[PDB]
Design a protein around this ligand. Structure first.
Ligand SMILES: COc1ccc(CC(=O)N[C@@H](N/C(=N\C#N)Nc2cccc3ncccc23)C(C)(C)C)cc1OC
Ligand SMILES: COc1ccc(CC(=O)N[C@@H](N/C(=N\C#N)Nc2cccc3ncccc23)C(C)(C)C)cc1OC
Ligand SMILES: COc1ccc(CC(=O)N[C@@H](N/C(=N\C#N)Nc2cccc3ncccc23)C(C)(C)C)cc1OC
Ligand SMILES: *[C@@H]1O[C@H](CO)[C@@H](O)[C@H](O)[C@H]1NC(C)=O
Ligand SMILES: *[C@@H]1O[C@H](CO)[C@@H](O)[C@H](O)[C@H]1NC(C)=O
Ligand SMILES: *[C@@H]1O[C@H](CO)[C@@H](O)[C@H](O)[C@H]1NC(C)=O
Ligand SMILES: *[C@@H]1O[C@H](CO)[C@@H](O)[C@H](O)[C@H]1NC(C)=O
Ligand SMILES: *[C@@H]1O[C@H](CO)[C@@H](O)[C@H](O)[C@H]1NC(C)=O
Ligand SMILES: *[C@@H]1O[C@H](CO)[C@@H](O)[C@H](O)[C@H]1NC(C)=O
Ligand SMILES: *[C@@H]1O[C@H](CO)[C@@H](O)[C@H](O)[C@H]1NC(C)=O
Ligand SMILES: *[C@@H]1O[C@H](CO)[C@@H](O)[C@H](O)[C@H]1NC(C)=O
Ligand SMILES: *[C@@H]1O[C@H](CO)[C@@H](O)[C@H](O)[C@H]1NC(C)=O
Lengths: 314, 314, 314
């Protein structure tokens, strides 16, 4: 019987039932550092074109919102779009033999414009259904075979996390004062370092960075706080882990990868015009969770209340 | 007494107290599909004007951030604003009889500019207090009677949700592999379908889509995960519900509806100029919550501890 | 013994163990009101320049996302940047005596461009390492000594919070119907008022607004819901508190303050060009948390189960 009582007490200390768990409040501020030199040859409208230039912080990212930030790793640029009438891009759905194939007003999910009910030539006696939209229609083409900002794995992200427990009135930040800021996060060498190379994060998660960077993806950074408020056993430090949140469906219907359509509006020769930039990139989700533990007398009284009857039966 | 013990055991199985609840981690990636053809007549500065064009994905929305995305359903465009001196728009607060009514430097909450202390004609011997701001002052006028992007109810939103329970080390996504992607969500016909028509969501919540689309609103999509990790009773699927989070105050002081002031900056004839686009739309909040349940021995020991003393009293 | 039983019952009522706690769902919609007149003298490239104009809502803020909104309090504008070759800005790392000091291709964390391996004059026989980037390189200079939008403390923010408890099926909003909207939040005078002056929030947190506004910071607004669902003791109102989430590291390596690099792209004389606006401001994080309490029979049965054995021992 005594060993059952003792296994009860040990169950208390091991489960930490004497402490009252408190939820975790987290705020995140991130600063991304690095630049990328882009020199590549991109085929546009069947003609070879040269993409060159340097991309600094303002070019490939924007400030974090909703505990998540994004890094553009690749892109496809269509310029000079203007509202008008224009044959749709040749695809399995758009090709037409005659005007009967196109219904005036028909909207297709792959199509970016409303059909005009006419079947017209796109190029060299190959006819698509004419549509009304921003034109010329953006190409239906694959992403660049090497991601233009393939240096995205070399950039470094600095994460600054502030956590507060209101029930215990305890506030602490991810970066303790006096810590040597110059470090690169490592699983064993620098567990508390807040500077993470993106390629390091992809190596930890086992996913090759380049492949994800070609068509875009969603990565996730987990910050764990297992915190104890008792003065005789106190420790409130974060544990960094990395997980790939992207589904990797690899199906055209499921919209694989992470990419969005950017629209820049300008006026030229007294004409309303748009430049459409298809943006491919890796969005990093920062997930912070924690429990605050302090000795609660009432919780210990309820636990004792259970283990007294559980105790007498032994 | 035996029926009290048995009602205790049944209370355990029914409340699932033997399992330890775990918090839910959710990440959301959404892709919106559809286009809207806009043809309408809008009165601008007392003169009839024609608004026409096609709006594709890049025009009426932007990528989701903070587990929420927005769809512009209506708009009001003021163009050519430039910094300068200019009579404010005629309202109950702005109309002045003489220069004494305007105090130089006075800032009014409805006014977008600082008064210059002068009372000047706006149009046809009707005087407003002259202000310093981006001018001409945007009209104080109602939204278009039919929302310009009234097709907003026909668009379809694809929601992709990844949930993880860290305590149980269990990860699953909203879309199971192999599910037929071609579907439209229905309460009974397609409960697991991740494609939702916006008008479907507004019909479920009982709110007419057009009315909300005229002046904007805030809609909310709820995803519930009641998940059980035990191998003998395992089920971890989402439940979709829809709720209107917008307050619908319908009071000018409470800023009714959802709308924001967009600023596009350009330079013309060596002059700094701005175009102000008042954006009306429906912001969709995706709310995901869940509990992870697995058999915990210590929890069962504490419960047993209570029900043994509760038991002996019977 | 009777006093131990009674201290148990009092422990129940005081800890509210008879009620089952439910998590809190929060959605936030905020509308910011006010304008700022900016008249200041800013030194640019060693030459005095005059910054003047009026900033309305669209100029200094954008809609809240992820339960947080931002207000630009200060800025530094570099205009006319274009891709090319150009000497880096003179700093401790950039100054070069000869071409040997610069390595072709070297990327420096403080530098915004890739070195070309050449050491060239910046101004008056003072040589920096030549780099390839958007040029001229933005100045490495301090923020304006008075924040250009120093009126940021006078603006007013309206916060509208909707909370829902799903387990109890109870929904309520921050603003009750019929409340006089005209109010300014005060700790004692107006505890339920949803209109907060920014300078009021900084006075509550004890941080001078101007200092934070010069280089930017992160502020946090806490909304507490302690809600009871029982009809005989029902109260579900918010408690507003204010806390400064910014770390205030004041170290160049830790990127002190809150600021981000904004990029506006334009084309001039058939040349791709960029204007880089360094944005300093105060980001307000709205944190809402709550517990829903209703009488649960099973919870009371487990508590009774503990306190019966705890009871008999006395
Ligand atoms: C949130 O705060 C903002 C911060 C920045 C911007 C500007 C912006 O849209 N930049 C985009 N990046 C580029 N171009 C564009 N657009 N980067 C390129 C720079 C040169 C040449 C490029 N060529 C092709 C594609 C991208 C290019 C981005 C979508 C961030 C990748 C807007 C913000 O919101 C108002
Ligand atoms: C987050 O990523 C971004 C994605 C896109 C944009 C461009 C943008 O502001 N588009 C806006 N939409 C339109 N015009 C504007 N501005 N749509 C119209 C298209 C033609 C004619 C229109 N005419 C009147 C009103 C809107 C029009 C929008 C505010 C989204 C409704 C910026 C982003 O942040 C950098
Ligand atoms: C999210 O919805 C958007 C709402 C607005 C904008 C426009 C914008 O970027 N405005 C910026 N504010 C200014 N200029 C810029 N850029 N304000 C100035 C107005 C005159 C003169 C100024 N001069 C210097 C610095 C700022 C100035 C801001 C970054 C908000 C401070 C973009 C949005 O995303 C698509
Ligand atoms: C990252 O930097 C290292 C060292 O400069 C270089 O060897 C490597 O090729 C870079 N990676 C990419 C993708 O450019
Ligand atoms: C939180 O703890 C600090 C510790 O010094 C104390 O000064 C402060 O008053 C506490 N907060 C409250 C609300 O009691
Ligand atoms: C920080 O660490 C780096 C390398 O680990 C070292 O070069 C540097 O001197 C350290 N800084 C301090 C202040 O110790
Ligand atoms: C949505 O589409 C249907 C079928 O094309 C059409 O009958 C309906 O009028 C559309 N709704 C709007 C608001 O355009
Ligand atoms: C989570 O479960 C999987 C199941 O195969 C296992 O391989 C993995 O090691 C587990 N994670 C941890 C941290 O133990
Ligand atoms: C999916 O369902 C649609 C209609 O419900 C049907 O036309 C289509 O053939 C289905 N796809 C598969 C692969 O069964
Ligand atoms: C805020 O407004 C008051 C009253 O108009 C004024 O005295 C004060 O100087 C203003 N503050 C700033 C920073 O402009
Ligand atoms: C929530 O409570 C209201 C109170 O009238 C009730 O009408 C509604 O049916 C309840 N919801 C559910 C899902 O039972
Ligand atoms: C609201 O309060 C203000 C000042 O506190 C007062 O001037 C106004 O008349 C009040 N409104 C109502 C409807 O009572």
């Amino acid at each position: 019987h005594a060993l059952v009582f003792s296994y009860i007490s040990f169950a208390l200390i091991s489960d930490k039932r004497y402490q009252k768990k408190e939820p975790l409040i987290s705020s995140v501020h991130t600063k991304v550092k690095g630049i990328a030199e882009v020199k590549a040859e991109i085929l546009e409208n069947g003609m070879k074109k040269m993409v060159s230039g340097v991309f600094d912080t303002a070019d490939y990212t924007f400030p974090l919102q909703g505990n998540s930030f994004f890094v553009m790793t690749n892109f496809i640029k269509t310029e000079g779009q203007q509202q008008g009438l224009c044959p749709d891009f040749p695809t399995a759905r758009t090709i037409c033999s005659s005007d009967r194939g196109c219904k005036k007003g028909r909207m297709d999910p792959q199509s970016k414009g409303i059909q005009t009910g006419r079947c017209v030539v796109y190029k060299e006696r190959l006819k698509t259904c004419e549509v009304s939209a921003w034109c010329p229609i953006e190409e239906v083409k694959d992403a660049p075979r090497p991601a233009l900002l393939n240096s995205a794995e070399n950039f470094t992200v600095l994460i600054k996390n502030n956590i507060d427990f209101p029930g215990h009135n305890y506030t602490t930040r991810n970066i303790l004062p006096g810590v040597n800021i110059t470090c690169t996060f490592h699983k064993t060498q620098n567990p508390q370092c807040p500077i993470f190379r993106l390629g390091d994060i992809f190596q930890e998660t086992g996913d090759s960075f380049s492949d994800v960077a070609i068509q875009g993806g969603i990565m996730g950074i987990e910050i764990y706080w297992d915190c104890n408020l008792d003065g005789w056993f106190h420790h409130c430090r974060p544990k960094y882990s990395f997980r790939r949140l992207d589904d990797k469906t690899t199906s055209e219907s499921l919209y694989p990868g992470y990419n969005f359509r950017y629209a820049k509006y300008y006026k030229e020769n007294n004409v309303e015009k748009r430049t459409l930039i298809k943006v491919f990139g890796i969005r990093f989700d920062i997930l912070v969770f924690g429990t605050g533990g302090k000795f609660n007398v009432i919780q210990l009284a309820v636990y004792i209340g259970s283990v007294i009857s559980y105790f007498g039966l032994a």
